[PDB]
Amino acid sequence: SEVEYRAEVGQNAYLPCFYTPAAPGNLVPVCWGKGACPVFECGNVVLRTDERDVNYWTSRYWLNGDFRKGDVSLTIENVTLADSGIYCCRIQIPGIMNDEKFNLKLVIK
Ligand SMILES: Cc1nc2c3cc(-c4ccc(NS(C)(=O)=O)cc4C)c(Cl)cc3[nH]c(=O)n2n1
Numbered sequence: 001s002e003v004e005y006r007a008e009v010g011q012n013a014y015l016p017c018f019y020t021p022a023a024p025g026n027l028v029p030v031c032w033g034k035g036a037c038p039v040f041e042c043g044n045v046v047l048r049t050d051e052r053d054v055n056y057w058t059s060r061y062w063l064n065g066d067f068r069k070g071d072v073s074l075t076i077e078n079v080t081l082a083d084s085g086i087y088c089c090r091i092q093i094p095g096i097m098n099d100e101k102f103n104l105k106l107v108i109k
């Protein structure tokens with residue numbers, strides 16, 4: 001079919017997203033949301049970081065990887081069937097018309 005990420009109800013879901021910081025400690029803000037990246041900034045926002053730290057999160061949504069090294073992969077805890085969908089991870093590279101947009105398809109059964 002096409003790239004997808006899978007989980008059963010009650011498991012954690014794992015959606016990958018990565019960037020390479022220009023130099024260590026120099027982080028780029030990231031936008032995670034539910035819905036494809038053409039929607040608003042990154043869909044219906046679930047989690048955000050800035051140059052310093054996580055600045056916004058929704059219950060059950062986590063960055064448990066080394067986000068200070070560019071691993072901004074998402075964990076969704078205790079998934080239900082309502083969690084299926086496209087998710088947008090947007091790397092907000094400083095500057096205009098240069099963001100990286102990743103659309104991740106999650107299928108729960
Ligand atoms: C009570 C609760 N807390 C969180 C939470 C917290 C975080 C978070 C916030 C700052 C940092 N930065 S730090 C201090 O340098 O490690 C690191 C993380 C992982 C995230 Cl991403 C997601 C979260 N999701 C969530 O459902 N809950 N619930």
Ligand SMILES: [Ca+2]
Pocket residue numbers: 092093094095096097098099
């Ligand atoms: Ca940009």
